[PDB]
Every structure is written in structure tokens, then in C-alpha cells.
């Protein structure tokens, strides 16, 4: 690793979680619309990481802001890079998380969030095939989470 | 986050740890030489992440391979991007870690590793100022670790 390399500045960071319940259902957040006839796409509870702050703590805070649920990160799953049209790079971080016990889902309805909810493994497979999951990485990490927790893999 | 972006493929991933002992000393690994008169530079225990495997588990394994110490990741600190001369991108991941109790440091001497050892906060500051820390990010993360653990910040 003593090989010379240059720094590739990353301007933005986002942090989110793949939160599963006892049945292996995954918690997703839905965007508010897209034509006016279609429903918004789904994504994992996530949000922006403040410059200089810990991404893991941000994942916990942002998840609560969107779903109203207090979560505990259990293990890092992965990070991936995206580039906006203008060249800005964003590094997204994803953790496997567990919800604290005794909580009721209470999504924060905003101009960006329609709602949030738990979706079963079978229904997620349908949503994915129907092109309703905003970022395909969600399926990659959900699969990792199911394996980590000892749940059956996604249908077919 | 519903804004369109493209994928920026990252070909290589590395995972390492900032491991501190009860006194706040940091565990570092030294490269084998550099002119033949100078000592190798120092870096955190780290190694390559296999394609498709969990970076956090890799951090634990690679740390043990270089230092002979079994470590437990306690919290994710950050990830950053580098680019090799040929254009290849490498994403380095860093975790704060704790060493399992009752262990003796036993570095793996190879053509790439001269040795490994715990360095105090004061001596790290000297090594850094003397340009002996391969990646400056090591100081950034050591500072984070000291704060997280409640230790005094690096000298001056
Ligand atoms: Sm926020
Ligand atoms: Sm850029
Ligand atoms: Sm996978
Ligand atoms: Sm290895
Ligand atoms: Sm490339
Ligand atoms: Sm910092």
C-alpha cells in the first residue's frame, strides 16, 4: 500500500441503515411522487452527514428523522460512490441496524417524504422487479443483511 | 437525494483500524525501508478487502495478520478515496478498535512490514511533524479516536 496515489476529494457524504425487524422485513422510506400518476420510489432511511461529523452517528440521527424510529447500528455493510451531473461526488454509507424495542412507526411527512414502512422480503422482490427501488444498491445490502441475520434470501 | 447521479466504480478497497490501548497509545505498522539510510514510514494496521466481502470483517482479519493481535471494531470512523497513477480508485475504511485482553504484540515480518508497535500520543506528534506517518489521514483519525475515548488531544 506504500504505492503513490493522489487524493480524490469527496464533497458530500450520506449515511443510512438497512433496518430489519424480527421477521426480516426491511424499513423503507418513500419519496413524494415522481408523471403525476405514479407513486414515489423507495429508499433506505438515510440523510446527509455534516462535514466533519461521524457518519455512523449521522446514520442513527437521519434514520430517526425520517421514520421516527430510534435505531442501533450493529455492523457496517458498505459504502459506494456517486457523481452528480456537475461533478460533485457523494459517498453513501450503509449500516445494518436494529430498532430499539417498543416503538411505533411514525414517518415524517415532508415535501420529500410521503411515508415510511416495513416491507416483507417477498414484496421487496416485487417492488425491485417493478423498478420501484430508487437505488439498486438497496437490494444488494438487503441481501447482505438477510445473510448476516440468518434469514432466507430474497425470492427467486 | 432523488437527484440523478452516475456510478463511480471503485476497483479496490482497504480496511484498517485505529487501535488504542488503555493509555491512548496507538498501534502502528512500519514499512520495510524507503535512500537506504532512512527507516520505513508508519501506517495503521490495514489490508485489502476481498471483492464482495464485508470491509469491517476484513479490518479485523488484516489487523491480526500484520500485528498478531485480535481486535474488536467498536465504531466506524471514516472512509476516504485515493487514485493510483493509472486511474484505479481505492476506498480506505477506518474503524476505532479495541484489542482483546491478555495479548502480546507479535508483528509479522515480511518484505513489506518491518515491525509494529504502540506509540504514545507525544511520540506520534513527533513522528507526524518529522514526516514519518505515511498517510496524514492517520492523524485525523487518531484525533477522532482520542476524542471518542475521552483522552487528551495530540500535543500542541
Ligand atoms: Sm438531517
Ligand atoms: Sm468532484
Ligand atoms: Sm453482497
Ligand atoms: Sm490479507
Ligand atoms: Sm477508475
Ligand atoms: Sm475529525
UniProtKB/Swiss-Prot annotation, chains A, B:
Homodimer. Its cofactor is Mg(2+). This is Nudix hydrolase DR_1025. ATP binds at residues 1-5, 47-48, 84-86. PROSITE patterns: NUDIX, NUDIX_BOX. A motif (Nudix box) lies at residues 47-68. Residues 10-141 form the Nudix hydrolase domain. PANTHER family: ADP-RIBOSE PYROPHOSPHATASE, DIHYDRONEOPTERIN TRIPHOSPHATE DIPHOSPHATASE. Mg(2+) 3 binds at residue 13. Mg(2+) 1 binds at residues 46, 92. Hydrolase that can act as a nucleoside triphosphatase and a dinucleoside polyphosphate pyrophosphatase. The best substrates are 8-oxo-dGTP and 8-oxo-GTP. Other substrates include Ap4A, dGTP and GTP. May be involved in protection from damage caused by radiation. The keyword Magnesium applies. It catalyses: 8-oxo-dGTP + H2O = 8-oxo-dGDP + phosphate + H(+); 8-oxo-GTP + H2O = 8-oxo-GDP + phosphate + H(+); P(1),P(4)-bis(5'-adenosyl) tetraphosphate + H2O = AMP + ATP + 2 H(+). Mg(2+) 2 binds at residues 50, 62. Its EC number is 3.6.1.61, 3.6.1.69. It comes from Deinococcus radiodurans (strain ATCC 13939 / DSM 20539 / JCM 16871 / CCUG 27074 / LMG 4051 / NBRC 15346 / NCIMB 9279 / VKM B-1422 / R1). Keywords: ATP-binding, Hydrolase, Magnesium, Metal-binding, Nucleotide-binding. Binds 3 Mg(2+) ions per subunit. Pfam families: NUDIX (PF00293). It comes from the Bacteria. GO terms for molecular function: ATP binding; hydrolase activity; metal ion binding. Belongs to the Nudix hydrolase family.
